[PDB]
Every structure is written in C-alpha cells, then in structure tokens.
Amino acid sequence: ITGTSTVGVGRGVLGDQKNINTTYSTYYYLQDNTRGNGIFTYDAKYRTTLPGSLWADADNQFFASYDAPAVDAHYYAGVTYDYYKNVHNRLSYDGNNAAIRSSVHYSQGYNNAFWNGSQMVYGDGDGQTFIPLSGGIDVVAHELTHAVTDYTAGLIYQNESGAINEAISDIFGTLVEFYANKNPDWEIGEDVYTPGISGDSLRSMSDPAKYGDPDHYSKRYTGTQDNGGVHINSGIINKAAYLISQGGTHYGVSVVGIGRDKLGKIFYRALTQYLTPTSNFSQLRAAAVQSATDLYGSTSQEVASVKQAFDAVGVK
Ligand SMILES: [Ca+2]
Ligand SMILES: [Ca+2]
Ligand SMILES: [Ca+2]
Ligand SMILES: [Ca+2]
Ligand SMILES: [Zn+2]
Fold it and tell me: Are residues 72 and 17 in the same domain?
C-alpha cells in the first residue's frame, strides 16, 4: 500500500524486543519500504489460502502473542536481504530488488516452512515439535535462499541436485545466522525445534550423523522417499562446507579451514556462475574448485582446502 514509512516496535517468538520497518496509512502495516521493492508480511489467519491479508496493526506496537511470528518473519527477511546485498552485492532474490513476501499463521499446528515459488510461508508449529518457524533466523534465511537458487542455478528438487539445493539453503541460512551474530552455530533450526528439549536441532552441519544423516558419500540414501533424500543427503555437502570453513580431520582426511567469509564467496560464485538445474555432487565439486580458482588462484590454500573437504566426504 501507499503510505508513510515509519518504525514500530514489537517482540519476537523468543520474547526479544526489536524495531521493525512499517508503513502508515490509517493502519500501520508490516511493509518495509527501505529494502528494494519492499518486504511485505501477511496474516494467513490459520487458513491455507495465500497470501492472506497484509498485516495491519492499529498502534504500531507488536507485543501480542499473535504478533510474534509476524515480527520475526518481517525482521529476519530484512536481515537476510541485508546479508545478500552487503556481502554478495545481490539485490533481493532475483537480483533486481523483487519484493519479498511472507505469510505467517499458515494452517493449524503446521510444523513446516516453505517457499512456494512466489513467497515464503511459515506454520506456527504444534508447540511440541516446533514453535512458530519464523523465530529461527537460519530457517528464514534457508527459505529465502531457496528463492535465490530458483532464480540462479535452478537446481531441480530431486536426487542429488535436490540435495545440493537443500545444502545451499542450510549453508547460507547458517552464514546469515553468523552475519546477524544471533547465538551462531553450525546447527539448523535449534531456536524453534523441540522447546521441551535443550541442546538439540533438526540437522547438524558439523556432525550430520548426530541425527542420522550421512556424512560421507558411501552412506548416501538411494531410496525414493523425500524426493530421493534431499533433506538427508544434504548432510554430505553440509559436512563438506563445514570442513572448508572450520577444518578438521574426517575419515582420515585432514582439511585446513579457510573461514566462513571465503566459504560464502566460493559457494555463492559456484551457485551463480557454474551450477545448472541437473548438477550432481561431482559437478558441485568441480564448480567449487573452479570458483575457488577464479577467486584465489589454482595453487592457493583455498583451492587445496576445497579439494580436501570433498575428498573427506567421498565426492570425486
Ligand atoms: Ca498493536
Ligand atoms: Ca543459533
Ligand atoms: Ca543455527
Ligand atoms: Ca529443542
Ligand atoms: Zn529447504
């Protein structure tokens, strides 16, 4: 809508207070005009019809329990936009400042979040397995990254290309978490997963096997479930990414870590310049090596580390 840009205040899912960019026109709407063509957050009102209604508030204060998921979806979409713009010089997910839209309160007791090809959608969780999904910055960044992948490499969501698609979302979801410096870690979804259990997460990049996911190509899932195991086999790539950044010895292979910033530069270049819709793990290795070569030179430590990491997880 057309209005006056202003700033409101509210509390997120985890009870933290934060300022959010809103727009005033009779009501105060969750519409941020400071980023690209805007960030819009909608209320799905427990229904499955999308996008729902643009979030309207009477006083620009968002401290109601019902407001929490909206506050975080709106705020974290902004942080993710900032990350891509400031670190990778990318304007929104399409590179041309496309408006970012999110709907919260999707369905009832919905334990999922997703990108539907046009916008982000967040369930409220059942209160046992998950609390409102937008409360996790790595979750929000994971979803917006699916949009970035769709507009660039276009990795098909099946088998190995799908696992790469998933890993890319976990990798950048984690890098955004570090960017925001919000209790950063290499775990996925820890802030909104199982509120009754502390110390766990949905997936782990540092040790995928902790939750039963493969950490070596020899342990890859070859079944048909989960579109060929896209959320399972992503562990192989997530582990490789973790090793490239942090280093370590895995299955007898030692990797010298090169840091998170370089990891991000290497994978962003691979994603936007070399990967294609049908790329498999072997091609991802080639793309990553080429990207590191472009940026640091063929005889650099960076290239060596990328090769070592993929060797460690059995990807040739
Ligand atoms: Ca209010
Ligand atoms: Ca964290
Ligand atoms: Ca995390
Ligand atoms: Ca938990
Ligand atoms: Zn995903």
Answer: yes
- Class of residue 286 by CB neighbours under 10 A (exposed 0-12, middle 13-18, buried 19+): middle
Residues with Cβ within 5 Å of ion ligand 4? 193-194, 197, 200
The one-letter amino acid at 170: D
Amino acid found at 161:
S
CA distance 309 to 23: 47
Query: Do 167 and 147 reside in the same domain of the chain?
Result: no
This entry's atomic model was obtained through: X-ray
Whether 1 is covered by a domain: the verdict is no
CATH classification of the domain holding 100: 3.10.170.10
Resolution of the coordinates in A? 1.6
The answer to whether residues 302 and 161 belong to one domain is yes
128 CA → ligand 4 middle, Å: 9
Residues 143 and 205 in one domain: no
**Which ligand does the CA of 234 lie closest to?**
5
How many Cα atoms sit within 13 Å of 118 on the Cβ side? 3
| Annotated catalytic residue within 143, 160, 250, 302 | 143
250 is catalytic: no
Domain span at residue 86? Answer: 6-154
- Measured in Å, residue 186 CA sits from the centre of ligand 3 at 6
241 and 204 Cβ atoms separated by less than 8 Å: no
